[PDB]
Amino acid sequence: STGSATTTPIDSLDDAYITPVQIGTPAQTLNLDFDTGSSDLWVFSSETTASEVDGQTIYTPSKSTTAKLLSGATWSISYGDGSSSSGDVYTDTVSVGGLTVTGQAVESAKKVSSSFTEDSTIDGLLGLAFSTLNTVSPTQQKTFFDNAKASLDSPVFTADLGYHAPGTYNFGFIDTTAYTGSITYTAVSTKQGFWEWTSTGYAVGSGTFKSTSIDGIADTGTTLLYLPATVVSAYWAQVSGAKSSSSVGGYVFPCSATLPSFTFGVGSARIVIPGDYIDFGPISTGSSSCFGGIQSSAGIGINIFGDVALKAAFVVFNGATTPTLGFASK
Numbered sequence: 001s002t003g004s005a006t007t008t009p010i011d012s013l014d015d016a017y018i019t020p021v022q023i024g025t026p027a028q029t030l031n032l033d034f035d036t037g038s039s040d041l042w043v044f045s046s047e048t049t050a051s052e053v054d055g056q057t058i059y060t061p062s063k064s065t066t067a068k069l070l071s072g073a074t075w076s077i078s079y080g081d082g083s084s085s086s087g088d089v090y091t092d093t094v095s096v097g098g099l100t101v102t103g104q105a106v107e108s109a110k111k112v113s114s115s116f117t118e119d120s121t122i123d124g125l126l127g128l129a130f131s132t133l134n135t136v137s138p139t140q141q142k143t144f145f146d147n148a149k150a151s152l153d154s155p156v157f158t159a160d161l162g163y164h165a166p167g168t169y170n171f172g173f174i175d176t177t178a179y180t181g182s183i184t185y186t187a188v189s190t191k192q193g194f195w196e197w198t199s200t201g202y203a204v205g206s207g208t209f210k211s212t213s214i215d216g217i218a219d220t221g222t223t224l225l226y227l228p229a230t231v232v233s234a235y236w237a238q239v240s241g242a243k244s245s246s247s248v249g250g251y252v253f254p255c256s257a258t259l260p261s262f263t264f265g266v267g268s269a270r271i272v273i274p275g276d277y278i279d280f281g282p283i284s285t286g287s288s289s290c291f292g293g294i295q296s297s298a299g300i301g302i303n304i305f306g307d308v309a310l311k312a313a314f315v316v317f318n319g320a321t322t323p324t325l326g327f328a329s330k
Contacts, residue, residue: 001151002172003099007034007161010121013280014307015223017161018122019169022095023106024064030057030123034169035221036159036195036317037304039133039143040077041094042085042107043124044116052112055120059108066102067092075107075135080222080300085112089136094144096126099171101148105134105141125221128157128317133193145171145319155319159220160330161311163277179314179328184269188323192302194219195317197325199305200267202227204235205260209270216303218310218317218325224280225262225273226297226304235262235294242292248283251292255282262294264309266327273312 007017018031023043030043044053046060061067067090076086087110094104109124116122127134131142149155152172160178161167168178189196194217201211214227232251236242238260242253253259259275278293293308316326 001099001148002153002170003095003097003148004168004170005097006166007169008166009162009164010119012164014161014164014311016122017167017220017307019096019126021126023059024061024092025066026064027095028057028059028064030059031121032124032126033122033221034126034128034159035219036128037217037219037221038077038079038125039127039129039131039193040075040107040135041105041124041126041144042075042077042087042109044112045087045108047087048109049111052117054117057123059106059124061090061092061106061108064092067106070105070136070139070141073105073136073139073141075137077135080304081115083113083115085109085116087111089141096144096171097169099148099152101144104144104147105136107136128220129195130190130193132190145317148172149319157317157319159310159315159317161220161307163274163311167311174316179330181329183314183316183326183328184266185316185318185324185326186266188325190323194302195323195325200265202231202265203263203270204238205275207238209263209265211265214264214303216297216305218305218315220307220310222304222306223293223308224304224306225294225308226300226306227294228303229296229298232294232296235260236292244296248289248291250295252283252289253292255288255290257290264305269327271309271313271327271329273309277308277312
């Protein structure tokens with residue numbers, strides 16, 4: 001089997017991408033944030049505290065003839081940005097782009113933190129990291145991909161995120177028309193539960209490539225590119241007037257600037273992030289200070305190849321017995 005679904009930016013900055021997901025019988029379609037940095041499929045629901053729902057579409061398990069309470073199971077998650085959610089668990093039928101999993105754990109939120117409430121466009125998350133990170137207790141549950149894997153034509157999914165445009169998540173096949181050149185594959189460590197890999201270096205604009213190992217994670221659920229402070233300083237030094245602002249929370253730059261590209265290495269291959277992908281717009285409405293899309297990871301503990309980086313590539317998440325990642329230009 002295969003599946004193919006369009007993923008759409010939630011706003012004009014590509015802050016996140018939503019993909020429609022069919023849950024239950026008859027289907028209830030929710031727009032979920034596919035997140036290769038986490039491993040829970042959780043949704044706003046009829047059980048979510050009413051004051052914490054503000055425009056999201058909710059899953060109502062009582063209206064699904066295939067929903068079953070997973071008795072005793074609870075979940076609670078906290079994300080790298082400080083947001084969180086928690087609740088109980090149902091199993092139900094879940095379909096993405098024509099690919100159907102029966103008995104998928106659907107984690108129904110009883111509580112969500114304010115950042116989720118305040119984003120009316122995201123009805124929940126669909127985790128695509130390794131199932132060892134799933135938070136359901138006392139019986140850890142499998143991700144949608146893990147449940148689907150055996151049925152797929154090939155045990156892979158691909159992320160093809162658009163810049164200021166829709167893109168595609170495919171399951172079970174490589175669309176060889178979706179990229180240029182070849183796909184370069186690179187080793188993955190699953191020891192932390194992430195799609196963790198080592199970039200071979202970077203370049204700023206037309207500058208020389210610096211060969212240096214940068215361990216990080218491929219994370220579709222993170223907007224920006226978070227890299228070591230040395231790398232980030234080298235990038236922003238090429239933008240006149242750019243500076244790190246403790247009050248804003250990262251590097252800002254004059255909105256009048258033209259940003260240089262940023263290249264990262266994948267083995268001997270190179271992925272070029274155009275400068276315009278690094279512009280996240282005014283820090284507040286009407287400001288002439290703009291927020292940068294490349295930020296320091298120094299306070300995180302891990303480097304994160306988020307959407308800024310991933311949207312410049314066609315990315316293969318190869319879930320074979322020894323997982324690997326593939327990157328192609330597009």
